[PDB]
Amino acid sequence: PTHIAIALKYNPEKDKAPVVVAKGKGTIAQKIVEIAENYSIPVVRKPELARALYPAVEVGKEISPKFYKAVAEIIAYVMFKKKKV
Amino acid sequence: PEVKSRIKARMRELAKSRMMAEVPKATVVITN
């Protein structure tokens, strides 16, 4: 199958926005997923977004203000789910 | 050219090891 992934680091006090720490196609993508699952880092399937996000940004640099809309929605879902346990 | 491209390849490769090592620091991954 086709494979893509975008890894993001975000602290609430230090980062104004999410830093792209990795982006990946094919076996690179799969590697990021695997290490992450390995670290119990959440993984979200959002294809129109992952697609739209890939060419847009680069490794080590905080996402565009434009993306704040869909990314923040995701960080939100991720964290709502993790609250109960 | 054989060498310039071998240098390029290797820089590509090195950039990738850095990147995959920085993944343990992620908080979220978006996937297709």
Numbering used by the authors:
A (entry chain B): 264 to 348
B (entry chain A): 232 to 263
Which text from the study accompanies this structure?
The membrane protein FlhB is a highly conserved component of the flagellar secretion system. It is composed of an N-­terminal transmembrane domain and a C-terminal cytoplasmic domain (FlhBC). Flagellar FlhBC consists of a globular domain composed of a four-stranded β-sheet surrounded by four α-helices. The globular domain is preceded by a long N-terminal α-helix (α1) that connects the cytoplasmic globular part of FlhB to the transmembrane domain.
In the case of the AquFlhBC crystal there are three protein molecules in the asymmetric unit. The three molecules in the asymmetric unit are very similar, with r.m.s.d.s on pairwise superposition in the range 0.40–0.76 Å. Each molecule consists of two polypeptide chains resulting from proteolytic cleavage after Asn263. In all molecules no electron density was observed for residues 213–231 at the N-terminus; depending on the molecule, two to six residues at the C-terminus were disordered. In the SalFlhBC crystal α1 primarily contacts α1 and α2 of adjacent molecules, while in the AquFlhBC crystal α1 primarily contacts α4 and the cleavage site between β1 and β2. The major difference between SalFlhBC and AquFlhBC is in the N-­terminal region. However, a longer helix with a kink is not excluded in AquFlhBC, in which a highly conserved Gly230 occurs just two residues into the disordered segment 213–231 which is present in the crystallized protein but is absent in the model. A similar positive cleft is also present in AquFlhBC. Such a cleft might be a potential recognition site for proteins secreted by the flagellar secretion system.
